Paper text:
The [name] protein is the product of a tumor suppressor gene, and functions as a transcription factor that induces the expression of genes related to cell cycle, apoptosis, senescence, and DNA repair. The [name] tumor suppressor is a pioneer transcription factor, and binds to the nucleosomal p53BS DNA when it is located near the nucleosomal edge. The basic chromatin unit is a nucleosome, in which approximately 150 base pairs (bps) of DNA are bound to a histone octamer containing two each of histones H2A, H2B, H3, and H4 (5). Here we report the cryo-electron microscopy structures of the [name] DNA-binding domain and the full-length [name] protein complexed with a nucleosome containing the 20 base-pair target DNA sequence of [name] (p53BS).
Residue numbers in the entry:
A (entry chain A): 38 to 134
B (entry chain N), F (entry chain K), K (entry chain L), L (entry chain M): 94 to 291
C (entry chain H): 28 to 122
D (entry chain G): 13 to 118
E (entry chain B): 21 to 102
G (entry chain D): 27 to 121
H (entry chain C): 11 to 119
I (entry chain F): 23 to 102
DNA sequence: GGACATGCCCGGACATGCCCTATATCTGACACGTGCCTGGAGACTAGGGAGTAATCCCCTTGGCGGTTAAAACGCGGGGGACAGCGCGTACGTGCGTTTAAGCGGTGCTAGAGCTGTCTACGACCAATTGAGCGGCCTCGGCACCGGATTCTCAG
DNA sequence: CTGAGAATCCGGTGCCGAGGCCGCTCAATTGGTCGTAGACAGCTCTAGCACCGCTTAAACGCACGTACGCGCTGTCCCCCGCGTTTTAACCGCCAAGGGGATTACTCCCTAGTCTCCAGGCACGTGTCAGATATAGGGCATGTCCGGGCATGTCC
């Protein structure tokens, strides 16, 4: 049957998700992860809805920006595929690693 | 079809090119070619002359094949064939199968192929050089449905692919052009050429 | 009946001044309030530090102006200083 | 009758509220009369600039109401605003539709 | 006690995040590093948020605590209070 | 037909050329030739003189053959023949088969061929050097349908191909001219000549 | 005789003599130590002030200072500093 | 009148409780300041000074130097993960950088 | 003027060496000069702004220390 | 033939030498002339304290050394050794200075 | 033929009359009737409605026959038939013999007769009474050559004779009309009507 | 077909009449009836409500049959059926044979007949007296080809004949209306109504 | 041969397909009204912080000279950047499955938030004085020089 | 393996800046008072957590093909490293002046308090724009036919 060329659908998805504003991380697993990490900081914590939404907005913005920088570093090396070493370089140059 | 025929222009060793007559765009001219669009506009069952030009003469046994495919990529795998109505009507010339879109007129040595592997229809004739004075060989095609026929081309544009082959069917050269089969070739040609500016 | 603090009516008046045909959503209003409060805190803090560094105990217009020049980009700083100066001069005359 | 300093100044942000927020922010023991006027005036100016650009972006999007997306477009498209808000994340703002040239097809 | 919730951050979610960041192709090995990075972010942000919560004599992390934590980490977030 | 006869002019070793009388264009003229068009205009069954000119005399046993083909390329493979009406009417001269378009008048040694391989009709006579005192040999052809005959030429123009051949049928020379068989040769010749300026 | 200029030089030297009785200090290095101490001072006092403001608190206490230290200082450093501060404050209160 | 003794001595600290208290009062941080806040602050500042000076002394002796110079302070700060984190955005004048060569730059046999 | 040439090629090489690079392209030097110049424009702007607010005519070391601090890189050793 | 080290040995030697010490590497007076030149483009007839220029110089060298560290790391990431302008531009872009 | 069919109008016991539609004289109307001339003008193979009117209903088994004869007395004995071209072309509807001029369309019970004694062609259908709520019965004829067809009617006018017959062929009634089969019925009808004044 | 179904209106013992909705003549109109023309204009495969009115209730077992015939007399004997394209497309509702033009929608007791003797298609449902609140029973027909379908109705107008019949198919009543199946019913209805004045 | 006789072709224009767009219906969230109350405005007061003027001195600017180390320039070469090519494998794309995320309703109770009270606690102020800073002096750590030792590199 | 170039180390000499001591002064301490703010109790009522159920869209596992990362090879160019020339950076030394810090006097500018009143903020409410489907409205493109030309015919 019909099959799209490698790259067209990836670009279509990039345009699609950069045009819109809905959150891309699932609510319930993000909340579960946040709560799991929290048990080791303070017991039986309760979290407001707007607090979990705040953590999710911050996390998605941070990851999107990090992926932007990672993509720029990969393309700089005449590559297209992002590597773990790309993430590590981006975070080291940003100064958190 | 399991495959899609290549449409890449390939003049090959013999410098194979197509040529077309200079018919104008009177409303109902029977067959008219648009250089701007590389597109033939023609009426159903009417004569469509296509000139074969070569820089040098291919060997005896060389054949010329014509095949239609849909131009739009999502339709490319669909075999181009006649609509159910024209398939059934009684217009066969005694040589062409009823479901073949493209016929050659005026050639007793015409062969019609229904490819067992690709399911593609095609029509093939022996290549004949021109006389030493003349400069090209003309083949006369007939298209046996309108582009608009429902259950057939259903308003989808097609390409005609013309290939020059040796006696085994190996590729010697290839050219192609778009085709619109319609009631008013001159009207429709001028409309599409005008829309180029839009 | 818990009174809060927002600039909603003033933002709406400025918007109607610049574009008296456009509305604003709740999320957008929240973003505008966050923005204005953030700027306010930044400018007031820089002015406070400026005053302390210079052994000044009063918040006056010169530290505000200098802080604006430090924080705002070129054209933004120039236009803001011009508008602030004209407005303060008109008020001072009006008393 | 009572007439406010903003009214005498022809400005929209409230001189009294900015003054009170300065007085209660534990910033200095005294505050001059002109300082909150200047600060309020700068805030009007910046608000007018941001709402101007966001309205423009909304009209380009055939929208009559500004949304966070339009605010993000306004801040990131303007060179000086992006600098001023270089370390600021606007929620539901998204990113600019920017594609690197080397990644485009040949 | 929630256990192994890190597996809830799925591969397609990270792929979508990369798409929004402009990434066209993603190695299979990307995911564990991304997960680690995400985890690191959470341990720092939540630590500050909970610290504020405990100072305020509260047991519920508020939106303002998180926004303030983000601000003091330089990643100021707009939309949940100033 | 499986093939198309060559129409290339070939004067050959003997300097073979055609000549025609200088008849004018009275609408009623029986046979008139147009140098501008290289086209004969003639009435059905009327005498059409064609002169054979040679620079030197071909050997005894040399023959002269005439064959018609359609001029338009898409009709070239269709055998030129009489229409069903004229085929059936009782006008045979005792020598010519009823379906042959072209006859030779006044020659007992005329032969009519229906080619088994090409299906083409032709009429052949022995070549005779000119009578002493003459510079050319004249052959008298008759055309037995109008160009307009329905079910026959059906308004399609034809060429007459005249070949000089040896006793085995090998080509010695070739010439050709267009033919219109019509009711008013003079009228139609002037019309087509005028249209040359259009 | 110039104006009174305050510094931590004598206190840095006393701590140094506690931890390294036979080690000295250069003027450039002492200046670096003073810059360091002043920077930390500014960070801690500012964060504590902001913490107190956020909670509608008008008094500077030891809880905001300790929490600010925990925010700014890394893990084991925070634990040791908190332990030292609590012991020191309880001993002072005993007096 | 009772003999005058300072709060720093009462707390077993070297940094001046009175001076830190005055700087808190005059730093425009709040109208009111508790008695224990400057004690706590002095204790944290003294602790950080003692650890940085300890590490700088170690580096100085490793270099056979008896006087602390900025180089030793920079080495001490950068050689400690927690101090390096705390001072991630601080440049020490006359401090230099840590000796470090990436493996890819070393020669190969 | 021409004074940008006073930060000579060997000076950029030495700074780069302390940055740990082993080889330096010929196109590096102008780039470094541009980066350095931009940095200076931003720093000196802030320093002079502070100097003018204090109603002074000479930029002091403390002016520079405040400029560097607000630029996001605190400099130790020059007061404060 | 006179002695000559292969490319790199002397480079490493200067790296070790300048990473061991802390004395300034950029010339004082040309930098001073540059700073005063750049400054008149903001305010004419400006003066500079000596310790102000030394502070600016210390800051500049620390900034350049850090930028060159990051540039080197980016070059090594690309399996390269020689740094080029695009490396500088990537380092500054990722840092958020562009 | 050995004989000539009578053409005398005979309404007979059932008051048999013909009627025709009021179609105007548009140049190329498919079928138009002239009351002035009692003449139908129609195109080849096109529908020609003829109405059968009766005063009272003929018995079951009554048939309606149509036959053409040449109108001019000297041609009357010549059987009217299709020309050689149309006779040979492939247009039979599966019911009508190829040489019959006159066909009935849309009637499965049509019979075509080639009279063994007279050699005349004719086409016959069963007479169907009009629905008791109707006035006439319409039969639809097709004429399969032009009046001008060479080798056929060859420009000679014909009459169509319509006879009402019993089961056995016994004359119940007779009517007739002239027919011109031509390319432009409206043009030709107006011309002949004008010429009536000349 | 060997025969033609009667189209005579016959209200019969039960006073059988048809009724239609008052739909106007706009764009996006799927079914509209013209009282002036007694003609339904509808879109392909859209719901066409036809009301059955009776003065008194027919016995249980009474059925309602619908059949199409060509309106023009020369086409009357040709069975009305779907064109080759729609016949082949995959749109059967599981109940109707693919070649039937007329379907009834929303009736499990629908029967489709292909008459062995006449070859006519028809669709029949049990008659049900009107629902509480109505003086008529509504049947919903679908027409599954456009009047213009080539190889099908081919632009020829049809009549729908609605017959009220008994169990043994005996006639209790008959009514009919003209139908045009088309893309723009409102447009086409207004056009034909306007032309009534021409 | 001129005047028709008579078929054929096709541009005009209608028949009649199909998409194409702009006009008709919901929803909760945003835009406006109201009441109130509390925070902002007018007025008067003190007092102290800031403006201004004179002074002094130090510390910034400018100049001269030398001299030497560093910058500039030339040139050889080698090794590293970079382009091309092959391959194989890891990732993109699609499809069927399943899994859990999402949404809607419902509970309840933990805990945020507000109010009242009062007492501990920090601002404030005067007297004291002793801790801390500026200045002066000195000596020892470090820096500069030179020469032998060791390391390290490349041929 | 070895020679040569660079770095390291070891010792001697000097020098200048860090450490210590002393005078002084002003800023921290102590003692007392008073307002106020926040710690605690108590009541409210909001919303966060927990659960159930249904749906469906997203995740997941896998098949497959192929594009890209990566390794290898060749090339050439351009940067390193070293020798030679130049130049200007630096150190020292001196002169001047100007502006930065200091002090004293004054005055006006803002906190503080009181009194009042109007603006801004909960509470309430209604209606308008988002999606879909129906009404215009364009194209999309086949068939018929009147006009005008082509071509036969003949007294």
């Amino acid at each position: 049957p019909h099959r799209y060329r490698p790259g067209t659908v990836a670009l279509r998805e990039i345009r699609r998700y950069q045009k819109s504003t809905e959150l891309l991380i699932r609510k319930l697993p993000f909340q579960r992860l946040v709560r799991e990490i929290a048990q080791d900081f303070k017991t039986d914590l309760r979290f407001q809805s707007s607090a979990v939404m705040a953590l999710q907005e911050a996390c998605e913005a941070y990851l999107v920006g990090l992926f932007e920088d990672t993509n720029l570093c990969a393309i700089h090396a005449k590559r297209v595929t992002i590597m773990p070493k790309d993430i590590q370089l981006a975070r080291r140059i940003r100064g958190e690693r | 079809s399991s495959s899609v025929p290549s449409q890449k222009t390939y003049q090959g060793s013999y410098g194979f090119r197509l040529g077309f007559l200079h018919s104008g765009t009177a409303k109902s001219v029977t067959c008219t070619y648009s250089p701007a669009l590389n597109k033939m506009f023609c009426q159903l069952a009417k004569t469509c002359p296509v000139q074969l030009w070569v820089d040098s003469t291919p060997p005896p046994g060389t054949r010329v094949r014509a095949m239609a495919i849909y131009k739009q990529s999502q339709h490319m795998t669909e075999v181009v064939r006649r609509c159910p109505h024209h398939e059934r009507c009684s217009d066969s010339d005694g040589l062409a199968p009823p479901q073949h879109l493209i016929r050659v007129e005026g050639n007793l040595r015409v062969e019609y192929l229904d490819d067992r592997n690709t399911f593609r229809h095609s029509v093939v004739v022996p290549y004949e050089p021109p006389e030493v004075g003349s400069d090209c060989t003309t083949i006369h095609y007939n298209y046996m449905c309108n582009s608009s026929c429902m259950g057939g081309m259903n308003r989808r544009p097609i390409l005609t692919i013309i290939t020059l082959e040796d006696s085994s069917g190996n590729l010697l050269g290839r050219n192609s052009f778009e085709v619109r089969v319609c009631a008013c070739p001159g009207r429709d040609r001028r409309t599409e050429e005008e829309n180029l500016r839009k | 009946r818990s009174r809060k603090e927002s600039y909603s009516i003033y933002v709406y008046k400025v918007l109607k001044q610049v574009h008296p045909d456009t509305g604003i959503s709740s999320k957008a209003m929240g973003i505008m309030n966050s923005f204005v409060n953030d700027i306010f805190e930044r400018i007031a803090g820089e002015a406070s530090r400026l005053a302390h560094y210079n052994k000044r105990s009063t918040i006056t217009s010169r530290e505000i102006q200098t802080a604006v020049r430090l924080l705002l980009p070129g054209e933004l700083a120039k236009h803001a200083v011009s508008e602030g100066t004209k407005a303060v001069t008109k008020y001072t005359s009006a008393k | 009758k009572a007439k406010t300093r903003s009214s005498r100044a022809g400005l929209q942000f409230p001189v009294g509220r900015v003054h009170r927020l300065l007085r209660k922010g534990n910033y200095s023991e005294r505050v001059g009369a002109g300082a909150p006027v200047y600060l309020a005036a700068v805030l009007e100016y910046l608000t007018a600039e941001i709402l101007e650009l966001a309205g423009n972006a909304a009209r380009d999007n055939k929208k009559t109401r500004i949304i966070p997306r339009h605010l993000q477009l306004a801040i990131r498209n303007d060179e000086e605003l992006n600098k001023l808000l270089g370390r600021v994340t606007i929620a539901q703002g998204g990113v600019l539709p920017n594609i690197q040239a080397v990644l485009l097809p040949k | 006690v929630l256990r192994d919730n890190i597996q809830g951050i799925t591969k397609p979610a990270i792929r979508r995040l990369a798409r929004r960041g402009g990434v066209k192709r993603i190695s299979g090995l990307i995911y564990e590093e991304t997960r680690g990075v995400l985890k690191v972010f959470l341990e720092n942000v939540i630590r500050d948020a909970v610290t504020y919560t405990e100072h305020a004599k509260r047991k519920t992390v508020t939106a303002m605590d998180v926004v303030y934590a983000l601000k003091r980490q330089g990643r100021t977030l707009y939309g949940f209070g100033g």
